[PDB]
Each structure stands twice: as structure tokens, then as C-alpha cells.
Scaffold this active site. Sequence first.
Site, PDB file in Angstrom:
ATOM      1  N   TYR D 217      50.203  90.358  45.710  1.00 19.35           N
ATOM      2  CA  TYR D 217      51.306  91.210  45.275  1.00 19.35           C
ATOM      3  C   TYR D 217      52.703  90.629  45.520  1.00 19.35           C
ATOM      4  CZ  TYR D 217      48.143  95.323  44.757  1.00 19.35           C
ATOM      5  OH  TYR D 217      47.216  96.219  44.374  1.00 19.35           O
ATOM      6  N   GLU D 247      75.843 102.462  28.687  1.00 18.73           N
ATOM      7  CA  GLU D 247      75.900 101.632  27.482  1.00 18.73           C
ATOM      8  C   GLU D 247      74.518 101.083  27.149  1.00 18.73           C
ATOM      9  OE1 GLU D 247      78.937  98.608  28.014  1.00 18.73           O
ATOM     10  OE2 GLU D 247      78.323  97.399  26.310  1.00 18.73           O
TER      11      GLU D 247
HETATM   12  N1  LIG Z   1      52.888  94.782  42.229  1.00 19.01           N
HETATM   13  C1  LIG Z   1      52.486  95.584  43.183  1.00 19.01           C
HETATM   14  N2  LIG Z   1      51.637  96.546  42.898  1.00 19.01           N
HETATM   15  C2  LIG Z   1      51.262  97.299  44.008  1.00 19.01           C
HETATM   16  C3  LIG Z   1      51.702  97.017  45.270  1.00 19.01           C
HETATM   17  N3  LIG Z   1      51.130  97.893  46.168  1.00 19.01           N
HETATM   18  C4  LIG Z   1      50.381  98.697  45.427  1.00 19.01           C
HETATM   19  N4  LIG Z   1      50.417  98.371  44.088  1.00 19.01           N
HETATM   20  C5  LIG Z   1      49.716  99.096  43.025  1.00 19.01           C
HETATM   21  O1  LIG Z   1      49.791 100.499  43.322  1.00 19.01           O
HETATM   22  C6  LIG Z   1      48.663 101.221  42.781  1.00 19.01           C
HETATM   23  C7  LIG Z   1      48.135 102.228  43.816  1.00 19.01           C
HETATM   24  O2  LIG Z   1      49.198 102.971  44.394  1.00 19.01           O
HETATM   25  P1  LIG Z   1      49.250 103.138  46.024  1.00 19.01           P
HETATM   26  O3  LIG Z   1      49.565 101.795  46.665  1.00 19.01           O
HETATM   27  O4  LIG Z   1      47.880 103.631  46.516  1.00 19.01           O
HETATM   28  O5  LIG Z   1      50.463 104.157  45.995  1.00 19.01           O
HETATM   29  P2  LIG Z   1      50.806 105.090  47.243  1.00 19.01           P
HETATM   30  O6  LIG Z   1      52.045 105.860  46.834  1.00 19.01           O
HETATM   31  O7  LIG Z   1      51.166 104.323  48.522  1.00 19.01           O
HETATM   32  O8  LIG Z   1      49.554 106.065  47.286  1.00 19.01           O
HETATM   33  P3  LIG Z   1      49.220 106.917  48.557  1.00 19.01           P
HETATM   34  O9  LIG Z   1      48.593 106.084  49.658  1.00 19.01           O
HETATM   35  O10 LIG Z   1      48.208 107.922  48.113  1.00 19.01           O
HETATM   36  O11 LIG Z   1      50.393 107.638  49.153  1.00 19.01           O
HETATM   37  C8  LIG Z   1      47.621 100.147  42.438  1.00 19.01           C
HETATM   38  O12 LIG Z   1      47.370 100.133  41.041  1.00 19.01           O
HETATM   39  C9  LIG Z   1      48.213  98.841  42.966  1.00 19.01           C
HETATM   40  O13 LIG Z   1      47.837  97.699  42.200  1.00 19.01           O
HETATM   41  C10 LIG Z   1      52.668  95.927  45.517  1.00 19.01           C
HETATM   42  O14 LIG Z   1      53.145  95.583  46.586  1.00 19.01           O
HETATM   43  N5  LIG Z   1      53.009  95.303  44.382  1.00 19.01           N
END
Ligand SMILES: Nc1nc2c(ncn2[C@@H]2O[C@H](COP(=O)(O)OP(=O)(O)OP(=O)(O)O)[C@@H](O)[C@H]2O)c(=O)[nH]1
EC number: 3.6.5.-
Lengths: 426, 426, 430, 430
Positions: D217, D247
Amino acid sequence: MREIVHIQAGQCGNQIGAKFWEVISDEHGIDPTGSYHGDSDLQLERINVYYNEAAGNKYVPRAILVDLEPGTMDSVRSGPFGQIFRPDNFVFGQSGAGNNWAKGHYTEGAELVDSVLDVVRKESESCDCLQGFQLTHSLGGGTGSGMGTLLISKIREEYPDRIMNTFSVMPSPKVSDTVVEPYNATLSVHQLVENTDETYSIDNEALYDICFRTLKLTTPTYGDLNHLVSATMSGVTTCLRFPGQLNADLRKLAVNMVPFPRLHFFMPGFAPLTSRGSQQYRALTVPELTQQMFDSKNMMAACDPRHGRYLTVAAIFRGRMSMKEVDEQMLNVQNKNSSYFVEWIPNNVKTAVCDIPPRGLKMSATFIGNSTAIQELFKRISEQFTAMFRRKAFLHWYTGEGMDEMEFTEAESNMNDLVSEYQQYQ
Amino acid sequence: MREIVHIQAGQCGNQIGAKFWEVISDEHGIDPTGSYHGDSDLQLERINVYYNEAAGNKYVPRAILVDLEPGTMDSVRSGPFGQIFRPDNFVFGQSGAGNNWAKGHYTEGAELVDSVLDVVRKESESCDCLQGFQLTHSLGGGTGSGMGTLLISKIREEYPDRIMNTFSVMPSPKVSDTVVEPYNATLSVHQLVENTDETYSIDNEALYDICFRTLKLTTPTYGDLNHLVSATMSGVTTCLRFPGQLNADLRKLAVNMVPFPRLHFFMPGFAPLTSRGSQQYRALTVPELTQQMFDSKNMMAACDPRHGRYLTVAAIFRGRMSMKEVDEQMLNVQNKNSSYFVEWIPNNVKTAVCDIPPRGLKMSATFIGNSTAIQELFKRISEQFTAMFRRKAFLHWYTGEGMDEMEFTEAESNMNDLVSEYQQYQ
Amino acid sequence: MRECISIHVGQAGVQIGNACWELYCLEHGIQPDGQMPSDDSFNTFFSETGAGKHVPRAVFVDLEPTVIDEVRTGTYRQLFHPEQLITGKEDAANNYARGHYTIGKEIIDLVLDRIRKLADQCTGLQGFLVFHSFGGGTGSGFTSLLMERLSVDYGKKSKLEFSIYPAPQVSTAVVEPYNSILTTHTTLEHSDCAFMVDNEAIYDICRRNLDIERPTYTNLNRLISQIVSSITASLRFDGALNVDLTEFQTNLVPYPRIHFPLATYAPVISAEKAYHEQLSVAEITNACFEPANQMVKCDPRHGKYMACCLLYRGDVVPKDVNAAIATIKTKRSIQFVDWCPTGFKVGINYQPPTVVPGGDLAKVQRAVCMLSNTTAIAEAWARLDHKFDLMYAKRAFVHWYVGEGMEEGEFSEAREDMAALEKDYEEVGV
Amino acid sequence: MRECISIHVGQAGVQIGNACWELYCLEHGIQPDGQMPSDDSFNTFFSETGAGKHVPRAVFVDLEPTVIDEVRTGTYRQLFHPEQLITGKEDAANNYARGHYTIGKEIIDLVLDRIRKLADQCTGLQGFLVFHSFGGGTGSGFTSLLMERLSVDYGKKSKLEFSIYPAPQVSTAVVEPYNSILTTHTTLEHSDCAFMVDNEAIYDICRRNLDIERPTYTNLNRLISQIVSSITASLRFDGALNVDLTEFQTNLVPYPRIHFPLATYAPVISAEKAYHEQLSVAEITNACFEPANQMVKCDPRHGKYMACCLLYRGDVVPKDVNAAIATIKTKRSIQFVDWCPTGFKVGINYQPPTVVPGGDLAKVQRAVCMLSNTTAIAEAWARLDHKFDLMYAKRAFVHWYVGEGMEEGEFSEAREDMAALEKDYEEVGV
Ligand SMILES: Nc1nc2c(ncn2[C@@H]2O[C@H](COP(=O)(O)OP(=O)(O)OP(=O)(O)O)[C@@H](O)[C@H]2O)c(=O)[nH]1
Ligand SMILES: CC(=O)O[C@H]1C(=O)[C@@]2(C)[C@H]([C@H](OC(=O)c3ccccc3)[C@]3(O)C[C@H](OC(=O)[C@H](O)[C@@H](NC(=O)c4ccccc4)c4ccccc4)C(C)=C1C3(C)C)[C@]1(OC(C)=O)CO[C@@H]1C[C@@H]2O
Ligand SMILES: CC(=O)O[C@H]1C(=O)[C@@]2(C)[C@H]([C@H](OC(=O)c3ccccc3)[C@]3(O)C[C@H](OC(=O)[C@H](O)[C@@H](NC(=O)c4ccccc4)c4ccccc4)C(C)=C1C3(C)C)[C@]1(OC(C)=O)CO[C@@H]1C[C@@H]2O
Ligand SMILES: Nc1nc2c(ncn2[C@@H]2O[C@H](COP(=O)(O)OP(=O)(O)OP(=O)(O)O)[C@@H](O)[C@H]2O)c(=O)[nH]1
Ligand SMILES: Nc1nc2c(ncn2[C@@H]2O[C@H](COP(=O)(O)OP(=O)(O)O)[C@@H](O)[C@H]2O)c(=O)[nH]1
Ligand SMILES: Nc1nc2c(ncn2[C@@H]2O[C@H](COP(=O)(O)OP(=O)(O)O)[C@@H](O)[C@H]2O)c(=O)[nH]1
Ligand SMILES: [Mg+2]
Ligand SMILES: [Mg+2]
């Protein structure tokens, strides 16, 4: 003595304006500090046309600088000549126009115009005899198009008999940086056709064509385009700043140039123009100055004058030259090209001749053409407007500022009425 | 911050538990004295998840130790890590459960539960924010099966919204040490299906199959089986103890893992696993970590997942690894094996990724599988129960503790109802 | 005695004035500071103050500052009285109605106050010499405002008027035909002898006679002043036959409205040509009847002559003049009217034509200015009223004139009054 | 003046934030302790205290401690104000209803109190930059609780929103489709421009352009921050054509609900490739119209474009930009709507793209971020609502959402409202 008040609106109007103040300061021999450093008494004789005299023999330009953002004021104030302007004449907001004509005219600039107009009064009351207003702006985007035409309306209502003279950079299909230029321009042309006494229609597509096919600039910037515009702005006022064999005030132009009240949209041009690698092989003489000046390649709007007829042309010559030679060439042009001039006017060319050519030229001509071909600029803007408006695309941004679809319908109605009046005489 | 309270019941629950405390003390760098001796700040950052901080920087595990006999307390207290536990948290009787579920639930443990539950209160009130209960027990015999499910019922009634998470060693036909395991287990599964939020179904036949056909241990002891169980216990809580690229709490597992409320019986697994004579020839990389993790040989219940479909799988990875590589492999698995996953869930795999792999590994995965094949474990227990119950064999030992033949009929009824719900989605 | 008040209006009139006063100063020997080193010959054109300073009997009027501020700064800054160089603030914009109704309405009572302060120094004022452009806004509109006042204030005094009139092809403005037609009431009702001149005719005279391939206006104005020096020479100098400024008109003007003579001058010649021909009285007399030397682009052979004033100056003798005009009567191409059997008024003055030292034009012992009433000039009017008709049929610029206080009907009333003048010059030729 | 409040929600939003604030600190020359060695260019993103410490205009919110406790301990522990790093006790469990109704209900009035204490330091606040996951419980449920409050508290202010959205194949959760569909009311009603991004598209961009075979990530978040640095560059720096944040929207958004543009950036390139090609304005402009560089797995050729914002930065000149987009109009594979004949908004900023020193991505003189409203994005919605339909037909996880205070009918009401958005993006393409 025939003072002009100059006004700059939005990014484009402040950029063609801030270059114009570098050009006329070179002519009048004024230093970037505002002090006079020129050669000649003739530079000083009419310095009052554009500058207030101030203490220590400093000259302060009678410019009002208007924007809805600080960043162009910051760019002008820090620029090559920025220190010359009065600090009180920089009038500005904080949040911009968003490229929205309704922010300019109804909200963001409607707040600011009370602070602009009361500075236009301080400059106009400092004049001995004001001849007119010289406003630089663009018809695309929101500040120049919508605030500048608000300001034209306010100054027109307050000064009904003075010349209102505007230099108006305006959209074209192949050189556009914005989605909503057809809307902004159509809402703005509806104000220019009623209020201005002259409007000089300028195009970035034609200013790039001069840079590529005449000057042979490999990478022309907006600074190079602003230099072409400001040469013709300096050109048309020359006869109220310098002596001549034939003097023509901006009003002596208008009376000859405008046959019917609303046909005041002009296509400017300049001569000589050369590449810096070919100035060595040209003779600058009036016949060659003429053959370029009437060339469809030389004019600063994308309308080819071979798609219409001229109503009037004005050729404002500068330099030591024969009146026989000038009167010969302006005859030869409209007799050998007679299919391109209206035959119900028996002479279509106004001439003027100033004794003082631009610094570093032996001769110059500034060209002004009133041509039925200018309809092609208003026709293409109206045809772009029509496609977006037939599906109401982007109109929540204008109606969210309290505007109506009825104002769009009335603006495009008045656009086609202006097109129809130029086409009528073709 | 997301505290766990851990509870150990009977011989098996105290043995898989007393090994689990040696594993998580090695991870957190805690000495057999209770003192911290670790390398890293990350070991100490979440020590509160499993321990109470105490005077002299001694850390006391939040474990309650429950038995109906003194001899397992004596074996734990004298053991490798026995001095680490709080003396007040050893709660015990004198006369055992007799391998009788009704002694556990109605007599010998019904006396003792008032002395257990009031210690579970002292630990849960010392928590800052309790996330759940982590109970280790067996379903054969009487203490873990009958007292442990009494204790689940009492803690469930008192803490209805906290996670109840149980690790449940349970009978199989070819590796049984007791005559009445079918009765004890059937009476116990009737309590797990209603009260727990997750139950991790573990089998000595599958734990011997890992030892013989993967680890190639010539003489695997219960100490070697307890080491396989406790690796997956440490695995599933990793994301509330260490940082990661994808964090998953025990509740973030449950919401993804449990489609319908009662389908919470999971089949755990671990990777890497190797013989000590072949660790030299493997590459530990995520594709090889995956190909073992989904192998029918790797999972800790005797149910072959090729006799059903997965509802959900969760792969909780640990180590420095690519999210593309993890997301690629968990896609490739369920597309190339698509006949083994339910097609009414469009992605069957949950992933989590911790930045801190187990001490002495570069990578690990703990596997959790919810599979319709788990019905084969409840079906075989029910088929063994049925043969003994159709002739009332051994029922004077249960009815002498005040139980009814109606409770046996109702337990086996609820067993076939759990089997029918897993078979429904197959 | 024998004074003339010279009034120079707009850019054309002021710049012809700046050539007239360049000439008169040389011809009387007055320095450009108005002093005179060492007879009352100067008295027609200059008042003399007790310091020995000769101050010109002239008013310069423009509605804008630019051209007169140049007169106030150049070599003649010390010649003129500072309050008879008169400027407004605002240009007339080539609009007759700004000159006549709106802008010139403010300056007129300052202009007439200077003319009164000149006329009160004249002991025997002979006339007014009024210089202007027919095509200008100040030229047409201010001259027509001024002449209406002078014709009630000085009703007896002769008003001679020198007009730069629009050409067949050459033009500097689109609205030159409107301003010229609106002026035709001024010349008919409030003028006594009106000398039309054309820029395109003088340019062709410059090309053929002076050998100058591409002239400025300064080359023309040194020919228009040479004619007024020749008209006024009999007022300033001794002659064999001096002609009075009313004696001139009694021979030029057959009928009250028929006072638009042509003028021509001879020898117009380059100094390089003037060595290789002898320039006798008969040669320079015959040069005046060439179409090539007429200063309006019309052909005298398409008319009949009514009267000529051959105003000879320099080394000319009455024998040679009688012998010359007997040959002009012999030639059938030069046709007179049946009712003028005399034809020629003659003047002969003893003062040679003065060379301006920067000029294109030769030293010669003899000159003639021929001023000539002929029916042919009606073609210069029939040219320009056809330019007016094309534009007025569309109303092509009329909103600028109506917008500055003019009645729209004045365009019809001016084209009507021009057709009545063009009728009169055809009607007398029979 | 020109402030932006940047709100980073859940693990995805906080970890993109930990890349955004890594970038902004390098780009303005702020140390990771908030000090600045040696113009107000930083002012959009940093408040300055009298010690000479620049404190970021950001809120970090998570319902669990783990990710923000890492921000409170790593190299940026001294950058942020300690009470604008906000944590709860309890994870949202990938359950929208814990984020929105049950757990996030406790933290919201502490989050809005910090946003108020930021907005009261803004002298001319431009908008909100909101960063989140569509698939998360905190990402969907807490962002939707927060936006509902910000849209009554700051109704005029623009709310730009940067969303990591579920992929075609790649997924991390079973319930990612439920959380994403429940979020569609937030983006429709309480957002002004919503930038969907996809992990699987950026992984493929990493494989093809950056030559990195298996990215983390941290490799993605250095591309998602490079886009917001390019959106906000005109707010922070001098340019030839600076674009305001309203804009931008007046050119991007044709209709009130049609505010889901794609984004792409060029040149995404490895430092080893970047020596062997010249990366001219026309090359990097054409790279933005490749399906290969879109950061959502949908094909732009299956749509029509409505409007593009080509936001150029570094050594770019308006000539080269006009010449580039004239070739994009020449190509028939790139199809626009009949009602947008202008097509392109252009911005040109003088500040080159900043390299993060640990990064995979080259130093280049020029970059463009192209933000692009196109009908094609409706396929990314038509993918994910087909994932929702299979599970909701069985009610496959609904008891966890109903168990935490959600109405069951909100699933039908969210799938309904998504079908009305997917209708609108098909309806305008005609
Ligand atoms: N690019 C990117 N995608 C991320 C990253 N961390 C999580 N994701 C994406 O986030 C999605 C899942 O969301 P979560 O990380 O579980 O979001 P959250 O808000 O922390 O969810 P909860 O734990 O339920 O509170 C997945 O599809 C991951 O691929 C990151 O650091 N970078
Ligand atoms: C030795 C020589 O002939 O030098 C010329 C020259 O080479 C040419 C190419 C000049 C040159 O023009 C340009 O380079 C140019 C570039 C982009 C856009 C417009 C112009 C020149 O720079 C421009 C410059 O003109 C002036 O200085 C005028 O006074 C002009 N003002 C300015 O350009 C100016 C520049 C900087 C600061 C202040 C003023 C002007 C124009 C109209 C009215 C008033 C003033 C001149 C004659 C020349 C150079 C120096 C090479 C030309 O410009 C003018 C207006 O004459 C371009 O084509 C003409 C023909 C000239 O031959
Ligand atoms: C050089 C090398 O690679 O050594 C390995 C090793 O050879 C192997 C065979 C180890 C080894 O495992 C066993 O011997 C074993 C025997 C019976 C039942 C289970 C394991 C190892 O002992 C186990 C040990 O693992 C750990 O220490 C972990 O931290 C583990 N904790 C404990 O095992 C532990 C032991 C005593 C006291 C406290 C903790 C752990 C597992 C999951 C979660 C947290 C911690 C490791 C890597 C190895 C040896 C040392 C040979 C293996 O175990 C693990 C969990 O990795 C068995 O197959 C794997 C693959 C390894 O390659
Ligand atoms: N010979 C000659 N003709 C001139 C001169 N100046 C102007 N003209 C002619 O005058 C005519 C135009 O008149 P203007 O110069 O515009 O007259 P004006 O009175 O100053 O007009 P306004 O500016 O409107 O007040 C043209 O046909 C010119 O050719 C000059 O110095 N000499
Ligand atoms: N010639 C010229 N054109 C400009 C300049 N800056 C911008 N323009 C162009 O003309 C248009 C002007 O709009 P702008 O002035 O930015 O809108 P405003 O600031 O809201 O009035 C832009 O879309 C550009 O294509 C400049 O310095 N010179
Ligand atoms: N893995 C494991 N299994 C055990 C252990 N001790 C006993 N078991 C097995 O699992 C069953 C557990 O029953 P037990 O725990 O003895 O009954 P209880 O003490 O009455 O609860 C026994 O029959 C054994 O087969 C141990 O240390 N580890
Ligand atoms: Mg004049
Ligand atoms: Mg989260």
C-alpha cells in the site's frame, strides 16, 4: 486635455494592461520608478493623457486595477513595472469568480463594484477634460466578462457622453482553456453591443497565428501575445499624445468607423511585423507597410476579411511620410480589392498620420477594420453556446448565483440580432 | 484498549491454555517470572490485551484457571510458566467431574461457578475496554464440556455485547480415550450454537495428521498438539496486539465470517509448517504460504473441505509482504477452486496483514475456514450418540445427577438442526 | 489702412496659415520673432507696436489643442499675440454638428472678441481672409458658425475664403461629403469670393512641375500661400495696374451667387527645370489655361469661362500682357460666354514672387496668379453630391450628427441648396 | 487565505494521509518536526505558530487506536497537534452501522469540535479534502456521519472527497459491497466532487509503469497523494493558468449529481525508464487517454467524456498544451458528448512534481493530473451492485447491521438510490 481613464479586469485584462503600461512608459520615457528619463519634449507634452503628475516629478498612471482574487495584483505589483501604479487603485476581492459570469456580475463583483467605481471617480475628477474610458478584459472566464461588463454599465450610466473604448480578448474553438467560455462570452456580448462606443475584438488563435506565420516565434508565450495587443492599444490613441499631419481623436475614429450605432466591433492589426532574422531584408516604406496591414494574416481576430466586406477601415500611420503616398496606397487598396468593401460607402478608408513613430521603428501603422466578417466570431460562440444550453449543461452554477434561463435566452437572442445586423450589410 | 479475558477449563483447556501463555509470553518478551525482557517497543505497546500491569513492572496474565480437580492446577502451577498466573485466579474443586457432563453443569461445577464468575468480574472490571472472552476447553469428558458451557452461559448473560470466542477440542471416532464422549459432546454443542460468537473446532485426529504427514514427528505428544493449537490462538488476535497494513479485530473477523447467526463453527489452520529436516529447502513466500494454508492436510478438524463449500475463509497473514501478492493469491485460490466456495457470496476470502511475524519466522498465516464440511464432525458425533442413546446405555450416571432423557433428546435434536443448516447451503 | 484680418480654422486652415505667415514674414523682411532690421508695405498683414515689433493681423482657431500648441512652441511662438492663438479642449471629430452646435458654441464669443480687437486697430479694413477645410468638423462647422456672426457684425466687408475641398479619388475621411454639403449654405450666403482648392490636383502639379515624386502637406501649403500673396500683392506693393480687393470682385463675380472661381499659378516649376526654358509673359499666361495646372480636378474645356483676373507680378510689362491675352482669345479650345466680350481683368504688380528658402519652387522674375470664374467647376460639385447621395440613401452616419443637436432635415435642405448652386452654374453658360 | 481542512478517516484515509503529509512537508520544505529552515505558499495546508512551527490543517479520525497510535509514534509525532489525532476504543468491524449509528455516534462531537477550531483559524477557507475507504466500517459509516454534519455546519464550502473504492476482482472483505452501497447517499447528497480510486488499477499501473512486480500500500498512497498535490497546486503556487477549487468544479460538473470524475496522472514512470524517452507535453497528455493509466478498472472507450481538467505542472507552456489537445480532439477513439463542444479545462502551474526520496517514481520536469468526467465510470457501479444483489437476495450478512441499530429497509433504499445514479450517468450520454 483629453485625459483617458484606463481599467484592467481579471487575469487577461491585467496582463494585457500591465504590458500596455510598459509600452506607453517606454514611449513617454518614464522609468519603472515613475520618474521621467526621456529624450524629448514631445514625450512630456501629453504625459497627462495617461499619467497623473505627482510630487518630485513622479508620474502615476491613471489605471484602475480590478480583480476578484489577490494573486494577479500580487503578480502585477511584483512585476517589471508594478511599483508605478497607485496602491489605492488596486481594488480586489479574496474569493475568485470561479470562471462564472454570474459571480462577476451578481455576487462577488457586485460587492466590489462600489469600491471600484468610487476610485474611477477620484481619477475622473482629477482630469482637466476627460475624453474617455479604456477598459482591458477577456470575454471567457468570469471576472473580465461579468465584472468588467458590470463596470461598463456603471461607468456608462455615470458618464454618458465620454468615449467608452474596450479591448476584448474573446473565445475561439481551437484555442480554448475553459468549458463554459460560450456562456460567459454570450452573456458579456449582450452588454458590449449596448454600452460601448468601440470594442476591439481580439483572439488568442489570431495572436498565435501572427506569432507562428509572421514573427516565426518557436514558443510564443502569453507575454508575446500581450505585446501584440498593447502595440495596437498604444496605436489608436497616438494622435491625442503626439503631433501629426492628420490628427484623429478616439471620437474622430468613432464618427468615421461606426455607420450604424451597434456596428462598433473592430478587428485590429499592426505593421511592420517581421521575424528578427528577416528585418534586414525588408524596406519599411508605406506601400510594404500597407500590403502587410491589409493581409488576412495580420489581423488579431480569426475572421478572414475575405469572408465579408469592410464597412470602414482606419489606418493610423506613424512616422515621417508623404501624404500623397499614404492617400495613393489607401486608394489603390480599396479599388484593387473593391469586392471586399461596401459599395454604398464611397470611400471606406479613414487615414491619420502622426509625426512620431514608435521607439526603434522609422514607420508604423495601426489598423482598425470594421468588417461584416466579424459575424463569424459571434456566430461560432453562439453555435457553441447553443449545444450546451439545449441540454442546460453547467447552468446550476449560474442559476445558483440567482440568474435565470430567461437571461441566457435573452443574451443568445441579442447575439443573433448582432450577427443579423452585420450579415444584413454583407 | 480491546482487552481479552481468557478462561481455561478441565485438563485439555488448561493444557492448550498453559501452552498458549508460553507462546504469547515469548511474543511479548515476558520472562517466566512475569518481568518484561523483550527487544521491542511493539511487544510492550499492547501488553494490556492479555496482561495486567503490576508493581515492579511485573505483568500478570488475565487468565482464569478452572477445574473440578486440584491435580491440573498443581501441574500448571509447577510447570514451565506456572508462577506467572495470579494465585487467586486458580479456582478449583476437590472431587472431579467423573467424565460426566451433568457433574460439570448441575452439581460439582454448579457449586464452583459462583467462585469462578466473581473472579471473571475482577478481571473484566480491571479492563479499560474489554472486547471479549477467550475460552479454552474440550467437548469430551465432563469439566470442559459441562462446566465450560455453564460458564459460557453465565458470562453470556452478564456480557451480552462482548465477543465470546471459544477454542474447542472435540471428539473423533478413531482417536477416542472415553466411552461417553458422544453424550458429553452432544450436550455441549447445544450450548455453543446459541451462546458463542465464534467457536474454533479442533480435533486430535487432525492434530496427529499434521504431526505425522506434515511435521514428520515420530512420537508426537499432547505437548506437540497443544503447540499447534496455541499457534492459531496467537494468530487470530494478532491484529489487536501488533500494527499492520490491514487490521482485523475479532469482531471484524465475525462480521465477515458469520453469514447467518449460528454458522460460527470454524476450522483453523497454520502456515508455514515443515519438518525440521526440510525447512532448509522451502521458500516461505506468500504463494507457498497459501498453497499449504488451503491444503486439506493443514486444517485442524478431520472434515475434508473437498466434502463441502466454504462460506467464508479468513487468512490473517503476518510479516513484511506485498498487498498485490496477498490479494493476487486469495483471488487465484477461489477462482481456480471455485467449486469449493459458495457462489452466492461474490468474494469468500477476508484478508488481514500484520507487520510483525512470529519470533523466528519471516512470514506466517493463520487460516480460519467456515465450511459446510464441518457438518461431518457434528454428524459423526450424532451417529455415535444415537447408538448409545437408542438403548439408554450409561444414562444412570447422568440421570443420577438429576438430568432427564428429555435433555438428551433436545440436545441431539439441536445437533441435527445445526447439521441441517450447514447442509442447506452445501 | 488697407488691412486684412486673416482667420485660420481647424488643422488645414492653421497649417496653411503656418505657410502663409512663413511667406509674409520673408516677403516684408520680418524676423520670426516679429522684429524688422534695416514704407508701410507690411501694414495690410501686420500691426506695428512701439518696440518695433510687427504683430500679424491673424486669428488661429481650433477646437482641439494639438496643432496650435505646435504653433505656440515652434519658430513662430514669438510672432503671434498669445490670446489670438485660440484653442478649445475637445476635438470636433469630423462632425459638422460638433463644430457648429455643441463644441464650437463655447469658443465663438472668445473668437469674435479677438476679431473685434483686430478690427478696432484697422484704420481702413479691406476684408477677411478665411482659411479652412471643407471636410473637417472644425473646418465646416466652426467656419459656418463664425461666418454667420461676421456677416451680421461686419456686413459691408468683403469675405474672401480659401477652402481645401474633397477630391475625385483622394480622401482622408468617410464623412467628408456630409461636412462639405452642409458647408454650401456658408459659402452661398455668408461669403463674397470662395477659392476652392483640391489636394489631388496640387499633388499632380507637384509630380509634373516640381519633380517631387511623393509630397507632404508642407509642399501644398507653400502653393496655397503663393496664391494669397499674389491676390493681396496689389494691397501691399507698387504696380503698373494695382487691383483693389473690391475691384477684383467687380470683375470676377457676374451674379451674386456666382463667386466660386478656380485659381492657378505660374510658373510652378523646379529650380532644375527653370534654367532650360525662358518663362516669358506669354509662356506663363498660356500655362494658366492648361488643365494640367488647375488646382481643382475638373477640366476647363468642359465649361465656358465668364471672367479671368490675370494677376501678374514681378518683371511684367502691359505690352507683353496685351500680346499674350490676344493669343488666348485666338485659341478656340478656350471658350468664353457670349455675354462677356471683354473677358480679362488684368493686374500688374512690381514685386517678384518670394522664394521660401526651404521650398521646392524656383526663383523666377515673373509670376501670374490667374483667378478664373468658369462653368466647369460645377463638375467638382456634381462629383461630391453623388458621394453624398449613396450614403444619405442609407442614412449611413446620420446618427452622429442628429446625436449632437442637428436637425435631420438639414441634410435634405443642404443637398437641395447645392442642387440650386449646380443649377445656377449650368444656367449662365447658355 | 485559501485554506483547506484535510480529514483522514479510517485506516485507508489515515495511511493515504501519512503519504499526503509526507509529500506536503517535502514540497513546502517543512521538517518532520514542523519547523522550516532558510512566501505563504504553505498557508493552504499549514497554520504557522509564533515559534516558527508549521502545524498541518488536518484531522485524523479512527474508531480504533492502532493506526493513529502509529502516527503518534513515528517520524510525524511532532508534526500534528496531539488532539487532532482522534481515536475511539472500539473497531467498526467492517460494519457500516457501527461506524454510523453505534460507535462513531460517541466520537463525532469531538471530531466536529476540532474541525471548528481549524475553521476558526482559516481566514478564507476554500474547502474540505476528505480521505476514506468505501469498503471500511469507519470509512463508510463514520464518513457518512461526519459529512451529514459538515453539510449543515458548512453548507456553502466545497467538499472534495477521495475514495478507495472496491475492485472487479481484488477485495479484502466479504461485506465491502454492503458498505459501499450504503455510502452512495453520502457522495450524492453531501459531497461536491468525489474522486473514486481502485487498488487493482493502481496495482496494474505499478506493474506496467513503475516496474515494481509486487507493491505494498505505501506504493499506492504515494500516487493518490501526487494527485491531490496536483489538484491543490494552483492554490499553493504561481502558474500561467491557476485553477481555483470552485473554478475546477464549474468546468468538471455538468449537472448537480454528475460529480464522480475519474482521475489519472502522467508520467507515472520508473527512474530507469525515464532516461530513454523524452516525456514531452504531448506524450504525457496522450498518456492520460490510455485505459492503461485510469485509476478505476473501467474502459473510457465504453463511455463518452463530458469534461476534462488537464492540470499541468512544472515546465509546461500554453502553446504545447493547445497543440496537444488538438490531437486528442483529432482521435475518434476519444469520444465526447455532443453538448460539450469545448471539452477541456486547462490549468498550468509553475511548480514541478516533488519526488518523495524513498519513492518508486522518477524525477520529471513536467506532470499532468487529468481529472475527467465520463459516462464510463457507471461500469464500476454496475460491477459492485451485482455483488450486492447476490448477497442481499440471501440477506447474507444483514443481521450484523440490523443488530447495531440500522433499519433493514436502508439496504433497499441504498440499492435504489445507486440505480438512480447509474441511470443518470447513462441518461446524459445521449
Ligand atoms: N491504497 C490503500 N488502500 C488501502 C489502505 N488501507 C486499506 N485500504 C483499502 O481499504 C479497504 C478496506 O477498508 P478498511 O481498511 O477496512 O477501512 P476502515 O475504515 O479502517 O474499516 P474499519 O476497520 O471497519 O473501521 C480495502 O479495499 C483496502 O484495499 C492503504 O493504506 N492504502
Ligand atoms: C532593430 C529592429 O528593427 O528592432 C525591432 C525588430 O527587430 C522587430 C522584429 C520588432 C521586435 O518585436 C518583437 O520582438 C515582438 C515579439 C512578440 C510580439 C510582438 C513583438 C522588437 O522586440 C520590438 C521593438 O519595438 C519597440 O521597441 C517599439 O517601441 C514598441 N515597444 C516595445 O516593443 C517595447 C518592448 C519592451 C518594453 C517596452 C516597449 C511599440 C510598439 C507599438 C507602439 C509603441 C511601442 C523593435 C522596433 C524591434 C525589437 C526590439 C527587436 C517587431 O515589433 C514592433 C512592434 O516593431 C516585431 O515585428 C516588428 C518589426 C521589427 O523589425
Ligand atoms: C530455524 C527455523 O526456521 O526454526 C523453526 C522451524 O524449524 C519450524 C519447523 C517450526 C518449529 O516448530 C516445531 O518444532 C513444532 C513442533 C510441534 C508442533 C508445532 C511446532 C520450531 O520449534 C518453532 C519456532 O517458532 C517460534 O518460535 C514461533 O515464535 C512460535 N512460538 C513457538 O514455537 C514457541 C516455542 C517455545 C516457547 C514459546 C514459543 C509461534 C507460533 C505462532 C504464533 C506465535 C509464536 C520456529 C520458527 C522454528 C522452531 C524453533 C524449530 C514450525 O513451527 C512454527 C510455528 O513455525 C513447525 O513447522 C514450522 C516451520 C518452521 O520452519
Ligand atoms: N493642403 C493641406 N490639406 C490639409 C492639411 N491638413 C488637412 N488637410 C485636408 O483637410 C481635410 C480634412 O480636414 P481636417 O484636417 O480633418 O479638418 P479639421 O477642421 O481639423 O477637422 P476636425 O478635426 O474635425 O476639427 C482632408 O481632406 C485633408 O487632405 C494641410 O496642412 N494642408
Ligand atoms: N493574451 C492573454 N490571454 C490570456 C492571459 N491569461 C489568460 N488568457 C486567456 O484568455 C482567457 C482569460 O480568462 P481569465 O482572464 O483567466 O478569466 P478571469 O480572470 O475570470 O476574467 C483564458 O482562458 C486564457 O485562454 C494572458 O496573460 N494574456
Ligand atoms: N490436545 C490435548 N488433548 C488432550 C489433553 N489432555 C487430554 N486431551 C484429550 O482430549 C480429551 C479431553 O478431556 P478432559 O479435558 O480430560 O476432560 P475434563 O478434564 O473432564 O474436561 C481427552 O479424552 C484426551 O483425548 C492435552 O493436553 N492436549
Ligand atoms: Mg480638426
Ligand atoms: Mg478501520
